Amino acid sequence: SEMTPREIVSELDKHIIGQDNAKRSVAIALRNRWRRMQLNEELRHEVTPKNILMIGPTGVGKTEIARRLAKLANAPFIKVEATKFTEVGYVGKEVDSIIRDLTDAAVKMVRVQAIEKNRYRAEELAEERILDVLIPPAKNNWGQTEQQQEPSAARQAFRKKLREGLKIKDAMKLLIEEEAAKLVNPEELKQDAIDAVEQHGIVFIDEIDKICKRGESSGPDVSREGVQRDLLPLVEGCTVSTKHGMVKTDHILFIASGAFQIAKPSDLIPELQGRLPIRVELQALTTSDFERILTEPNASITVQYKALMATEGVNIEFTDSGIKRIAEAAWQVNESTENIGARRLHTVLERLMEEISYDASDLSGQNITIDADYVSKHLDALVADEDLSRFIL
Amino acid sequence: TTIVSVRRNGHVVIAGDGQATLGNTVMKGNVKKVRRLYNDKVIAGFAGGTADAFTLFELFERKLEMHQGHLVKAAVELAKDWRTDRMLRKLEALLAVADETASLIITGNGDVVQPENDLIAIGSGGPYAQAAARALLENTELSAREIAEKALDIAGDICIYTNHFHTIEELSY
């Protein structure tokens, strides 16, 4: 009982501005995994993941989308740079590491995921180990069967007196790291992860375009295309040797991403083109786009900053003109120097807030207001001095 | 072309013409050969590739970056990578940069030279500019700009490869 595409897109909208097509795309991928489980044994083998290739400029949403998708599916996720492997012509590393690295992270998850879904029970039983070294009326019976039976009486007021109140606390934590372990099953835990990898794995391959042709030279194209060749089995369906078991890449979902300014998806090796059935483009972000990014996402950077500052007992407020001013800056720098997409926001927002971020603890209890005035005072000069821009922003 | 740098009292200028030639015909007539660099704290001129300059001026402005701003050292380091890297070694151009401190000339040969009276006159018209520049500086109270300009004009009338389109930059201190 998974979410529908529109449902998936929605959730994605909660974190990413624009890039609707990419969302619908990455959304159909997810839905199809549900769709597949709903078929007969025969078909379940024939239907493979509809791998996607995102086409677009830097920092405009590609990775975030893939990352949020995985999160939403609670699927193990892993990002990987394609060119990493062209290096293998010296030493580099082998592609199988992708599934291996994926599994390791797929484990770190199943672990933290299961251990956390236990740290509460272990603490309660923990006190039942401490509330046992303070009143031990164990065994069967002791007094009455009804009224006198319940031994809680003094014990109850005893545990409460301890909870809110060697060393109990020092003792419990020790019991926590003794009961929790004494409750985990590392056998199925090892296979738990594998099943994940195999049924919900999401591999993100960045720089796919950097692995393409170009009348460049024999040597380089040979190194590049090789990474493509080495990728085939992963994407066509094979078995990988995992430090924790054997994994079948057969249903892992692959989301490749490329600029394709220099190279075209048609330069990709034929076998690969076949296994990247979905093509989607992402647009460059607009100043307007920026303004939304700064605030709309539900854990937007601006929200984070406000929160971080609250920590210090300082109330921050972003004026609309302030936000607009921040956005323009990022855009201005990106156009005057090098366009790095939304990333520019973080640098700008961060330089802008330095003075406060430092003085924060001292303005404890104040009401600071970052309005268009403030912004301009702090960023205009820098934004203008190009050379200074390439260093500070 | 003709670039003319002069330094009188609290100012120092770099003026040049805008003629671009090819063979025996004028390619362009308003080429901007002088510009400002390093937060407009440095003024410079170039004789050559309208783009080679672009690459050079930048790296130069990259030296003034993490070298405090010592014009001289920055120039010494610039010419050093210019005389080295194939990339840089490829491009040809005469570099003339001044600043509050002192003005100087950089070349592909990895040469950092500074004329006697911080008077620079590079390009096919350099000599003519110099002769006129000195005559004035010698027998006149005219400003750093008035000489570099009048000097540049004079060159422009003698030199078949330089015109009267000017691009002047100045520095006061």
UniProtKB/Swiss-Prot annotation, chain A:
The processes (GO biological process) annotated in the record are:
cellular response to heat; protein denaturation; protein unfolding; proteolysis; proteolysis involved in protein catabolic process; response to heat
The effect annotated for residue 94 to W is: Partial loss of protease activity
One CC-aspect GO term = HslUV protease complex
A Pfam family assignment: AAA
Q: InterPro entries, alphabetically?
A: AAA+_ATPase, ATP-dep_Clp_protease_ClpX, ATPase_AAA_core, Clp_ATPase_C, HslU, P-loop_NTPase
UniProt entry tagged with the keyword Transmembrane helix: no
The entry's localization annotation reads: Cytoplasm
Answer whether the UniProt record assigns the keyword Cytoplasm to this protein.
Answer: yes
Indicate the segments annotated as coiled coil, or none if absent. Answer: none
Reported impact of residue 275 to E:
Complete loss of activity. Forms wild-type complexes with HslV and is able to bind ATP
Q: How does activity depend on temperature?
A: Optimum temperature is 55 degrees Celsius.
Keywords assigned: ATP-binding, Chaperone, Cytoplasm, Nucleotide-binding, Stress response
Entry function: ATPase subunit of a proteasome-like degradation complex; this subunit has chaperone activity. The binding of ATP and its subsequent hydrolysis by HslU are essential for unfolding of protein substrates subsequently hydrolyzed by HslV. HslU recognizes the N-terminal part of its protein substrates and unfolds these before they are guided to HslV for hydrolysis.
The record's family statement is: Belongs to the ClpX chaperone family. HslU subfamily.
Name under which the protein is recorded: ATP-dependent protease ATPase subunit HslU
The organism of origin for this protein = Escherichia coli (strain K12)
List the lineage, top down. Bacteria, Pseudomonadati, Pseudomonadota, Gammaproteobacteria, Enterobacterales
Q: What is the gene called? A: hslU
From Swiss-Prot, chain B:
The main location is: cytoplasm
**Which residues constitute the catalytic centre?**
1
What keywords does the record list, in alphabetical order?
Answer: Allosteric enzyme, Cytoplasm, Hydrolase, Metal-binding, Protease, Sodium, Stress response, Threonine protease
Task: State the Gene Ontology BP annotations.
Answer: cellular response to heat; protein denaturation; proteolysis; proteolysis involved in protein catabolic process; response to heat
Changing residue 159 to A/S does what? No protease activity. Cannot form complexes with HslU
Q: Please state the Enzyme Commission number of this protein.
A: 3.4.25.2
Residues annotated to bind Na(+): 156, 159, 162
Q: Which domain of life is it from?
A: Bacteria
User: Temperature note from the UniProt entry?
Assistant: Optimum temperature is 55 degrees Celsius.
- Consequence the record notes for mutating residue 103 to A: 50% reduced protease activity
Q: One GO MF term, please?
A: threonine-type endopeptidase activity
Q: How is its activity regulated?
A: Allosterically activated by HslU binding.
Catalytic activity field = ATP-dependent cleavage of peptide bonds with broad specificity
InterPro entries, per the entry? ATP-dep_Prtase_HsIV_su (IPR022281), Ntn_hydrolases_N (IPR029055), Proteasome_sua/b (IPR001353), Proteasome_suB-type (IPR023333)
Any one cellular component term from GO for this entry?
A: HslUV protease complex
Q: What does this protein do?
A: Protease subunit of a proteasome-like degradation complex believed to be a general protein degrading machinery. The complex has been shown to be involved in the specific degradation of heat shock induced transcription factors such as RpoH and SulA. In addition, small hydrophobic peptides are also hydrolyzed by HslV. HslV has weak protease activity even in the absence of HslU, but this activity is induced more than 100-fold in the presence of HslU. HslU recognizes protein substrates and unfolds these before guiding them to HslV for hydrolysis. HslV is not believed to degrade folded proteins.
Give the family from UniProt: Belongs to the peptidase T1B family. HslV subfamily.
Assembly, in brief, is: A double ring-shaped homohexamer of HslV is capped on each side by a ring-shaped HslU homohexamer. The assembly of the HslU/HslV complex is dependent on binding of ATP.
What protein name is recorded for this chain? ATP-dependent protease subunit HslV
Gene coding for it = hslV
